[PDB]
């Protein structure tokens, strides 16, 4: 895939159409990703404009959601990524993950440098997963796993 | 503990002094937290101004770092939280975690509502930890676990 | 119960259409919410794009307002919340509530930590109501009640 | 009082000194306000730079906190109000009150105009209080009451 | 009037249409307001989306401007106020009034507190007028009178 | 006067010192200005860093406030004007004047062009004053007069 | 002319249409302005939404550009001025003029106060022009002349 | 000269000290620049932190202003340029030059492309001059000349 | 070419259409530029709204992408340049180039002044190239060459 | 190295002191880096607070610049990176590199995806250098080479 986007609004408009079709058909993201061979977080992100689907997966989810051919092609385009409207989310569900950075951002930096050295934990060589578990004191919890390659910053 | 701060600069200035002392003694955050019964991420966050230490822990880490009595008291105050200088990090290590929100923020929202319902994953009823693991293709990875309670949004 | 939105403009455009229909029909928010079993602040918030209506309530208000089927479905979707155009309200009525935060925000923090401890008052496990009362000096007052669960912040 | 301030940093620096003295003396805001005849929310706000104390209350809390005469005078000055560092709070405790505005701001506007008419609920002819109540399902809740006069916008 | 708007663009789009019709008919704001019983500044502000007209005045000016019935209804709705595109005006005529705040804003505060006390001068219980007068040195001057109620801030 | 400033903090720090001296001496702005031959709004603005005092007036107010020689010189310097900390006021008293621009800014533009023509009302060839008047319905009002030269915009 | 605009988008949309017509007809700004009796900088600014044309000139340029009747009228309205999309230009050609302000803005202030006194150089009693001259060292230079009246700031 | 700065506050603090010395000595910028062989706008800009002086000129203005050795050296360093506190000036005198860009920025672009072609007018190969002249209508005007090299943009 | 744009959205909308046609036709940017005699970076920038194509190249790429006559004309107009949506990129691929400025921006300034003197490296007299090279440790690297003329800042 | 910083001002204050000593000693960055075995861009960046020096190079440059022991230790700490004061540079020399991104950022994205695929060019596994060459048309040019590892974005 050598084709890429420069205006996020094209794929975000498509995302809105996908969400409408998905709601009318009573489909879940887990159902849509099933059979693609790809993780639900990756497929969902592609539907929402933040990843590119391989052609086979694009045709499959296109069949499930009754998408037209321009849409199936758009899902294969490399996106102009960035899902937040204006830098800081307003939505409470999204905001909690930003607050996590406001409270723990320097702790994550400190502990990364302590355990790995100078450098970064990759957001590119990167997997994420959302797992629902029981809360042992009542209710439910989400265990969200961020799994990224350590890339060292070395002198030259 | 009923005492709280309203100006983050007081505790962040203390954090800079702590970091200098820690560098001069060749201490790690794992060693500073050792013997507190508290997770390294929680003790580190407190040192960096983002949590309150119980009195027993504030005296333990305060002895290790050779802190004066006013500083050991400050560490026990409830902070004015927010570690990012101006909303979006400039530091590459910190920025990568913001970038995962730009790429996956709407996917996190979508999968939380799918698995749990309307509501949020808490940043308060919340734990995190950082683990180093080997990458089978060579090198190292960080597995960062965000573990938060689901709190529902219900009609009233 | 698992479908959600990522672009607030869809539900906010629907809100504008609802307000036009509401004005044409000379309806109040109290009357629209009547018979839903739900509080007027919750139903109003849903009409304005900030909550999800259960199906029976969506169908009832949809009948009152002569909404089409796509609109009745939209009202049941979990919203991308955030009603303020650009972070700070321009509208005087809305701005006074922001001004209360500018004057009393640190006092609210200080008194919450004094009476409850470290942690937050929830905006999720949360009820709001607006009541009109007599001003004992002449005129009228609004008594606005913010009723939120205390969630503690404890070491881990 | 005809004297007023134009730079919030003077009173906010004083607030930081007050908070340290209060912490060293193991004092609550409730007992600092005790004996003033003034509500805890009002006295607390004055300490934090957001209200002016009358001279008798300023002398009383100044004695409790071992404040010098310049500081006791400063507490009587009419402040340059605004407690939020940079428009949107970073602190989770403070942020939840901003989030209430992002979710319910337009509902508050709508219900105010429905019950009272065109105009505003005053942030000046205004008082607030924080009460702790038991949650029947377990835990505690804060009932925060915002009590403001309705001021109409009338044609002229 | 109990109906209100939440999206300023509806009434501001109407204002643009009003302005085009007004220019085609070679009408002034003084003549549009003539016969309404209302001050030109109030009627003008309503046309520009910043006030609500009573039903009688709405039908009068709507006849003068050939507005459709939806538009005459819209002029009666309580607006989402805020006429500045993005917080600070770009237009020189409007900017000069902002500049008077940058130069005299703290003087206005100081003199209000000196003559009246703690509190505010209202923007709600408030009237505005613009008068043209001859300058004795040649040319003309605008005398703009801001007439607002004093609302005191007192302890509670 | 040919000397001018480029960093507003110098004169604003002096204003803070002036305000403390003024409070300790129980002085009003009206009595500080008495004997200068200059309007209270102009002298007050100069003390607050927004105008330059003529030498005789600078020496008179410097004697009343017991200012040092460098301070009396600074008051004569042409300032780097701009009294608002960060573009929009946080203080309620100051904010109300910004709110009058948000509500009436386009009405002021429209009526200026109607009565005078294209161009501006000057903030430079400009006088302002604040008058206290009784409200016939009870209480007090501020009548604030903005008196500016019309400067026309003509083709070239 | 007593008619004015409040939303720059109306005239800026017209400017885009004018520029398309101008491109299709292979016209220059110099020849559009020829026959108007007005300077090319003034007519060009009017086409671009930043000045109002007299009726005769609006009819003339409207004939050259094949403009409809509403467009010819809009060109005669007093604009809502402000040509920069979002405060600071992105375009390199426009940005250089902003950079001259970042480098020389305080020098312009200093030299204006030195030569003239307290006050401003007008942007209203103002004209500019652009001239091409040969660079003796090779190539070409632009000599851009800004010509504004000095307006003094005097005590009152 | 190969030494350069990265933090504008160092040279801007020096500028404030220069301004104080200049005021105490009753010197003008034209007087200070006399004998340097350099234009008053260039020398003034250097004093204000926006240009670097050659060694001989730095020593000369240092004598005139009684500057210490570190200050004379600082004036020779290549600056971190940018004189505006926060992107848009608040000061009326400097704001007018920004307004000149808001009104004429797109006209300057259009006329530069018409007279020269694609490319820019330089802010680097660039001279600035401020001239006081008589206003034939009465009073005084500033003729400010911006003289920049045209640099073309051509395909490669 | 003397025609220029002032609204970037027109050429950016054209870019979106070009990218769709390119994707449907399975074309690369290298293929589109082949035969123009122009560098792939220059032609690609023109397609994306950031350069102007000569007429011959516009017709050639227009035939390849099946563009209408209005589009082929638009590609020849001088653009309103600026490809970033809102100042800082959200897309990871473009963000990395912004991060190189956050890490090395002051080093680039320092080394430019050391090697060349006071002045700039041009973004106008400027060439850009992207090359793929093998990494001898495995994988691939991009070597991106920025080639700009040094323009000196000299006294005048 | 496991010690890291959280407040950039510490290392940036050290950078200012380094620059003063460097200027007093008439040192260049090339000769400060001589004998460290490290590229001049890397050593310069460390001095300016954006990289960490190994112990040997820290002692070696610290001797050349006559740094105390706390400073030599600081240079070895992992920095809080980010050299731009407020997101967009004001300085012309650094602004040009930002402008390169405003003109070519989307072209860099497009060509990276075409030559490499989905993913990024690393700013971490990354080196840069600045070379001075002759301009064959006359003058001098900078050739700035950005050399970064391609990191692919792959489905998971």
With the C-alpha atoms ordered G127, G133, G135, G141, is the resulting torsion angle positive or negative?
Answer: positive
Q: How was this structure determined?
A: X-ray
Chain J residues with beta carbon closer than 8 angstroms to that of B24: 73
- Secondary structure (3-state) at A8: helix
Tell me the shortest Cα–Cα distance from D47 to chain B, in angstroms: 11
Give the ranges where chain F is alpha helix by DSSP (H).
8-24, 29-33, 40-47, 55-65, 69-76, 92-115
Is residue B8 within 8 Å of B81, Cβ to Cβ?
yes
- HEC string of B23-91 equals HHCCCCHHHHHCCCCCCHHHHHHHHCCCCCCCHHHHHHHHHHCCCCHHHHHHHHCECCCCCCCCCCCCC
CA distance linking residue H69 with residue H72, whole number of Å: 5
Is residue I51 within 8 Å of H153, Cβ to Cβ?
yes
C-alpha to C-alpha distances, G35 to F128, G20, G40, I31, nearest whole angstrom? 45, 21, 11, 48
With the C-alpha atoms ordered F91, F95, F96, F97, is the resulting torsion angle positive or negative?
Answer: positive
H151:I125 CB<8 A: yes
DSSP-assigned letters across all residues of E72-98: HHHTTSBP-----TTSS--SHHHHHHH
H93:G109 CB<8 A: yes
C-alpha to C-alpha distances, H14 to C135, E119, F132, H73, nearest whole angstrom? 59, 41, 45, 11
CA distance linking residue D152 with residue C135, whole number of Å: 14
With the C-alpha atoms ordered D21, D22, D23, D24, is the resulting torsion angle positive or negative?
Answer: positive
CA distance linking residue G73 with residue B43, whole number of Å: 69
CA distance linking residue C95 with residue E150, whole number of Å: 19
End-to-end CA distance of chain H: 33
DSSP annotation of A27 = -
Tell me the shortest Cα–Cα distance from G100 to chain H, in angstroms: 6
Closest alpha carbon to C112 in C151, C155, C143: C151
**Inter-axis angle of helices E92-115 and H92-115, nearest 10:** 170
Residues 6 or more apart in contact with residue G56 via CB below 8 angstroms: G36
β partners of residue G134: G140
Sheet containing C119-134, strands listed edge to edge, beginning at the edge strand earlier in sequence: C119-134, C140-152, D140-152, D119-134
- HEC string of chain H equals CCCECCCHHHHHHHHHHHHHHHHHCCCCHHHHHCCCCCCHHHHHHHHCCCCCCCHHHHHHHHHHHCCCHHHHHHCCCECCCCCCCCCCCCCHHHHHHHHHHHHHHHHHHHHHHHHCCCEEEEEEEEEEEEEEEECCCCCEEEEEEEEEEEEECCCC
Q: Catalytic: which of A99, A137, A140, A141? A: A99
Mutation target among B40, B85, B102, B107 for the A interface, most CBs of A within 10 A: B107
CA distance linking residue J94 with residue J87, whole number of Å: 12
Four-point Cα dihedral G78, G84, G88, G93, nearest 10:
-120
CA distance linking residue H144 with residue G40, whole number of Å: 19
C-alpha to C-alpha distances, A51 to A41, E20, I112, J156, nearest whole angstrom? 10, 46, 39, 11
Q: Determine which helix (DSSP H) or strand (DSSP E) holds E144, and give its type and residue range.
A: strand E140-152
CA distance linking residue C29 with residue C20, whole number of Å: 13
The first and second tokens of residue B74, run together, are 């400050």
Is residue C112 within 8 Å of D128, Cβ to Cβ?
no
- HEC string of C17-43 equals HHHHHHHHCCCCHHHHHCCCCCCHHHH
The first and second tokens of residue B132, run together, are 């180093």
Is residue F45 within 8 Å of E104, Cβ to Cβ?
yes
Closest alpha carbon to J78 in A106, A118, B28, B13: A118
At E34, give phi and psi (nearest 5°). Answer: -65, 130
Chain J residues with beta carbon closer than 8 angstroms to that of H5: 19
CA distance linking residue H156 with residue H154, whole number of Å: 7
Residue E128 — left, alpha, or beta (φ > 0 → left; ψ -120 to 50 → alpha)? beta
Secondary structure tally for chain D: helices H, strands E: 6, 2
The first and second tokens of residue B20, run together, are 């200098």
With the C-alpha atoms ordered D119, D123, D128, D130, is the resulting torsion angle positive or negative?
Answer: positive
Is residue C70 within 8 Å of D81, Cβ to Cβ?
no
Domains of chain F: 8-76 (1.10.260.40), 92-152 (3.30.1160.10)
Give Cα G107 to chain centroid, integer Å: 24
Residue D49: CB atoms within 10 Å: 28
Is residue J140 within 8 Å of J105, Cβ to Cβ?
no
CA distance linking residue B8 with residue D90, whole number of Å: 10
Chain I residues with beta carbon closer than 8 angstroms to that of G91: 79-82
Is residue E45 within 8 Å of F107, Cβ to Cβ?
yes
Closest alpha carbon to H81 in H50, H52, H43: H50
At B43, give phi and psi (nearest 5°). Answer: -65, -45
Chain C residues with beta carbon closer than 8 angstroms to that of B125: 151
Hunting for tokens 């559009």 — which residue is that?
A: G32
- HEC string of J84-96 equals CCCCCCCCHHHHH
- Secondary structure (3-state) at J103: helix
- Secondary structure (3-state) at G80: coil
Hunting for tokens 């079709």 — which residue is that?
A: A21
β partners of residue J73: none
I102:B90 CB<8 A: yes
Give Cα G46 to chain centroid, integer Å: 7
- Secondary structure (3-state) at A144: strand
DSSP annotation of A79 = P
CA distance linking residue B74 with residue E81, whole number of Å: 45
Tell me the shortest Cα–Cα distance from A90 to chain D, in angstroms: 7
Secondary structure tally for chain F: helices H, strands E: 6, 2
Residues 6 or more apart in contact with residue G50 via CB below 8 angstroms: G79, G81, G83, H103, H104, H106, H107
CA distance linking residue E1 with residue E53, whole number of Å: 10
The first and second tokens of residue F110, run together, are 């429209």
CA distance linking residue I21 with residue I16, whole number of Å: 9
Q: Determine which helix (DSSP H) or strand (DSSP E) holds D41, and give its type and residue range.
A: helix D40-47
CA distance linking residue E122 with residue D146, whole number of Å: 20
CA distance linking residue H45 with residue G107, whole number of Å: 5
CA distance linking residue E75 with residue E52, whole number of Å: 6
Angle I50-I55-I57 (CA atoms, 0-180°, nearest 5)?
A: 70
At F123, give phi and psi (nearest 5°). Answer: -95, 5
CB-closest option in G117, G118, G155 to F38: G155
Closest alpha carbon to B38 in B56, B62, B24: B56
The first and second tokens of residue J148, run together, are 């970064």
Closest alpha carbon to D92 in B95, C104, B122: B122
CA distance linking residue A87 with residue C87, whole number of Å: 11
At D41, give phi and psi (nearest 5°). Answer: -65, -35
C-alpha to C-alpha distances, J57 to C59, J35, J38, J76, nearest whole angstrom? 73, 8, 8, 9
Q: Could you tell me how many residues make up chain C?
A: 156
Hunting for tokens 């005139």 — which residue is that?
A: H64
Closest alpha carbon to I156 in G144, H37, G143: H37
Residues 6 or more apart in contact with residue F40 via CB below 8 angstroms: E111, F29, F30, F33, F129
C-alpha to C-alpha distances, G106 to C83, E29, F79, J5, nearest whole angstrom? 41, 42, 12, 36
Hunting for tokens 């290549």 — which residue is that?
A: H78
Hunting for tokens 């991009």 — which residue is that?
A: I142
Is residue A17 within 8 Å of A61, Cβ to Cβ?
no
Chain E residues with beta carbon closer than 8 angstroms to that of C137: none
C-alpha to C-alpha distances, H91 to A83, F51, F123, nearest whole angstrom? 38, 11, 12
β partners of residue H145: G145, H129
What resolution in angstroms does the PDB record give? 1.5
Q: Is H31 labeled as catalytic in the residue annotation?
A: no
DSSP annotation of J70 = H
Residue E135: CB atoms within 10 Å: 12
- Secondary structure (3-state) at G90: coil
Q: Give the up-direction half-sphere exposure of residue E130: CA atoms within 13 A in the CB hemisphere.
A: 28
Q: Which residues of J97-134 are buried (b: 16+ CB within 10 A; e: fewer)?
A: bbbbbbbbbbbbbbbbbbbbbbbbbbbbbbebebeeee
Chains B, J in contact: 3+ Cβ pairs under 8 A? yes
**Inter-axis angle of helices C92-115 and F92-115, nearest 10:** 170
CA distance linking residue H69 with residue H59, whole number of Å: 9
Hunting for tokens 């001075």 — which residue is that?
A: J132
What does DSSP say about strands B140-152 and B119-134: parallel, antiparallel, or unpaired? antiparallel
Q: Determine which helix (DSSP H) or strand (DSSP E) holds I114, and give its type and residue range.
A: helix I92-115
Is residue H110 within 8 Å of G48, Cβ to Cβ?
yes
β partners of residue I84: none
- Secondary structure (3-state) at I42: helix
CB-closest option in E42, E124, E127 to D119: E124
DSSP annotation of F102 = H
Hunting for tokens 């698992």 — which residue is that?
A: C2
CA distance linking residue I114 with residue D112, whole number of Å: 65
Is residue J36 within 8 Å of J59, Cβ to Cβ?
no
β partners of residue B125: none
CA distance linking residue H46 with residue F72, whole number of Å: 27
DSSP annotation of I57 = H
Q: Could you tell me how many residues make up chain A?
A: 156
Residues 6 or more apart in contact with residue G57 via CB below 8 angstroms: F155, G36, G37, G38, G43, G46
The first and second tokens of residue D48, run together, are 């934090």
**Inter-axis angle of helices J92-115 and I92-115, nearest 10:** 140
Residues belonging to chain A with any Cβ–Cβ distance to chain C shorter than 8 Å: 12, 15-16, 19-20, 22-24, 28, 48, 83, 85-86, 89-93
Burial group, residue G145, by CB count within 10 angstroms (0-12, 13-18, 19+):
middle
Q: Determine which helix (DSSP H) or strand (DSSP E) holds E65, and give its type and residue range.
A: helix E55-65
CA distance linking residue C114 with residue H42, whole number of Å: 59
């Amino acid at each position: 895939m050598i084709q890429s986007q420069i205006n996020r609004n094209i794929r975000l408009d498509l995302a809105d159409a996908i969400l409408l079709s998905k709601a009318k058909k009573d489909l879940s993201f887990a159902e849509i990703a099933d059979g693609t061979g790809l993780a639900e977080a990756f497929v969902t992100a592609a539907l929402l404009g933040q990843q590119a689907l391989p052609a086979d997966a694009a045709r499959l989810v296109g069949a499930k959601l009754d998408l037209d051919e321009d849409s199936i092609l758009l899902l294969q385009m490399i996106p102009l990524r960035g899902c937040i409207d204006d830098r800081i989310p307003t939505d409470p569900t999204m905001y909690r993950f930003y607050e996590m950075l406001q409270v723990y951002g320097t702790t994550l930096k400190a502990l990364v440098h302590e355990k790995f050295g100078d450098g970064i934990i990759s957001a590119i060589n990167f997997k994420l997963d959302v797992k629902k578990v029981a809360d042992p004191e009542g209710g439910e919890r989400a265990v969200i796993t961020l799994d990224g390659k350590y890339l060292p910053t070395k002198p030259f």
